[PDB]
Scaffold this active site. Structure first.
Site, PDB file in Angstrom:
ATOM      1  N   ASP A  43      49.383   9.921  64.420  1.00  0.00           N
ATOM      2  CA  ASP A  43      49.350   9.984  63.675  1.00  0.00           C
ATOM      3  C   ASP A  43      51.593  10.861  63.036  1.00  0.00           C
ATOM      4  O   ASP A  43      51.883  10.728  62.699  1.00  0.00           O
ATOM      5  CB  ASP A  43      48.200  11.294  62.461  1.00  0.00           C
ATOM      6  CG  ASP A  43      48.484  11.135  61.346  1.00  0.00           C
ATOM      7  OD1 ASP A  43      48.495   9.974  61.250  1.00  0.00           O
ATOM      8  OD2 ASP A  43      48.907  12.121  61.066  1.00  0.00           O
ATOM      9  N   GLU A  84      54.460  20.588  59.441  1.00  0.00           N
ATOM     10  CA  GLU A  84      53.692  19.928  60.300  1.00  0.00           C
ATOM     11  C   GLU A  84      54.653  19.146  61.636  1.00  0.00           C
ATOM     12  O   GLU A  84      53.615  19.192  61.949  1.00  0.00           O
ATOM     13  CB  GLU A  84      53.371  18.160  59.329  1.00  0.00           C
ATOM     14  CG  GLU A  84      52.074  18.655  58.648  1.00  0.00           C
ATOM     15  CD  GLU A  84      52.184  17.212  57.860  1.00  0.00           C
ATOM     16  OE1 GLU A  84      51.954  15.845  58.353  1.00  0.00           O
ATOM     17  OE2 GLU A  84      51.220  17.082  56.603  1.00  0.00           O
ATOM     18  N   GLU A 136      48.067  11.416  50.681  1.00  0.00           N
ATOM     19  CA  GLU A 136      47.900  12.731  50.742  1.00  0.00           C
ATOM     20  C   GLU A 136      46.228  13.034  49.908  1.00  0.00           C
ATOM     21  O   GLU A 136      45.142  13.592  51.234  1.00  0.00           O
ATOM     22  CB  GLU A 136      48.647  13.760  49.714  1.00  0.00           C
ATOM     23  CG  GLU A 136      49.992  13.634  49.586  1.00  0.00           C
ATOM     24  CD  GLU A 136      50.597  14.768  50.618  1.00  0.00           C
ATOM     25  OE1 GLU A 136      50.085  14.226  51.762  1.00  0.00           O
ATOM     26  OE2 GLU A 136      51.408  15.108  50.912  1.00  0.00           O
ATOM     27  N   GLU A 206      44.605   2.421  55.810  1.00  0.00           N
ATOM     28  CA  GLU A 206      43.251   3.842  56.288  1.00  0.00           C
ATOM     29  C   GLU A 206      42.980   3.131  56.873  1.00  0.00           C
ATOM     30  O   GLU A 206      42.378   4.301  58.504  1.00  0.00           O
ATOM     31  CB  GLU A 206      43.104   4.364  55.133  1.00  0.00           C
ATOM     32  CG  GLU A 206      44.808   5.336  54.302  1.00  0.00           C
ATOM     33  CD  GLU A 206      45.639   6.664  55.338  1.00  0.00           C
ATOM     34  OE1 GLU A 206      44.696   7.250  55.996  1.00  0.00           O
ATOM     35  OE2 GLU A 206      46.339   7.240  55.224  1.00  0.00           O
TER      36      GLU A 206
HETATM   37  C1  LIG Z   1      47.370   7.859  58.542  1.00  0.00           C
HETATM   38  C2  LIG Z   1      47.127   9.232  57.517  1.00  0.00           C
HETATM   39  N1  LIG Z   1      47.419   9.231  56.432  1.00  0.00           N
HETATM   40  C3  LIG Z   1      47.235   9.834  55.788  1.00  0.00           C
HETATM   41  C4  LIG Z   1      47.923  11.075  56.090  1.00  0.00           C
HETATM   42  C5  LIG Z   1      48.458  12.507  55.181  1.00  0.00           C
HETATM   43  O1  LIG Z   1      49.145  13.416  56.002  1.00  0.00           O
HETATM   44  C6  LIG Z   1      48.400  10.968  57.202  1.00  0.00           C
HETATM   45  N2  LIG Z   1      48.735  12.197  58.321  1.00  0.00           N
HETATM   46  N3  LIG Z   1      48.083  10.003  57.523  1.00  0.00           N
END
Ligand SMILES: Cc1ncc(CO)c(N)n1
Length: 215
Positions: A43, A84, A136, A206
């Site tokens: 991520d 972040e 988001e 996702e």
């Molecule tokens: C895979 C993924 N989808 C959405 C977000 C939203 O920040 C993230 N951080 N990572």
């Protein structure tokens, strides 16, 4: 509305796409961090690629202006990304995840090329806003009730939950939704079909991303 209708229509992949980002469980008497550490590494690499994509939405919002105030919504979004990234680096150091040796996996590379496809000026504003909202919103959904859920488990990590589970991020997502929703309510049948396919494609990406770290 238009978005709520698409989510209902596509309930099944929306549920699949909004499952918990990682699981922390007990194994052989120890806390198993393997799913958490996989997610963190992957991520973080996704977020570094999400930054220029949000930058591109910001530009579009400043030029393709039906509403002046769209820019500030996107600008708040990209400013959060600054905080972040700093948080991710603090997590990497405390959990010994070396981001320079993380290898981006297939689902992560696919997602990154797709973000690139969305950065072209050939793509319509309502479509880009739908994608931005969706990315988001899946994090808001997946971290919703994270505190209360986490308290019901024997061991919980709290950092990510603070990041995407808070009311500030929920309200942010709503404000991005309101913009997307407004664009879609003024869109042709052709743009409406494009926006829906993009929504579906984010959810698919996702699900695949999620599969990298599942427990
Ligand atoms: C895979 C993924 N989808 C959405 C977000 C939203 O920040 C993230 N951080 N990572």
């Amino acid at each position: 509305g238009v978005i709520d209708t698409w989510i209902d229509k596509h309930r099944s992949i929306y549920t699949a796409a909004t499952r918990h980002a990682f699981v922390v469980s007990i194994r052989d008497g120890s806390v198993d961090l393997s799913s958490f550490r996989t997610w963190l590494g992957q991520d973080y690499l996704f977020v570094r690629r999400f930054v220029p994509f949000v930058a591109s939405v910001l530009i579009r919002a400043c030029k393709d202006s039906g509403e002046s105030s769209d820019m500030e919504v996107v600008l708040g979004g990209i400013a959060s990304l600054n905080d972040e990234i700093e948080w991710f680096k603090r997590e990497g150091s405390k959990w010994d995840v070396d981001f320079s040796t993380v290898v981006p996996q297939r689902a992560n590379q696919e997602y990154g090329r797709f973000l690139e496809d969305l950065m072209s000026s050939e793509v319509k504003y309502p479509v880009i806003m739908t994608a931005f909202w969706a990315i988001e919103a899946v994090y808001q959904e997946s971290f919703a009730h994270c505190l209360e859920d986490g308290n019901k488990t024997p061991v919980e990590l709290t950092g990510a939950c603070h990041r995407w589970g808070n009311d500030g991020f929920k309200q942010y997502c709503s404000s991005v939704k309101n913009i997307a929703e407004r664009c879609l309510e003024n869109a042709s049948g052709e743009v409406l079909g494009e926006a829906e396919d993009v929504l579906v494609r984010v959810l698919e990406l996702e699900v695949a991303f999620w599969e990298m770290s599942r427990g």
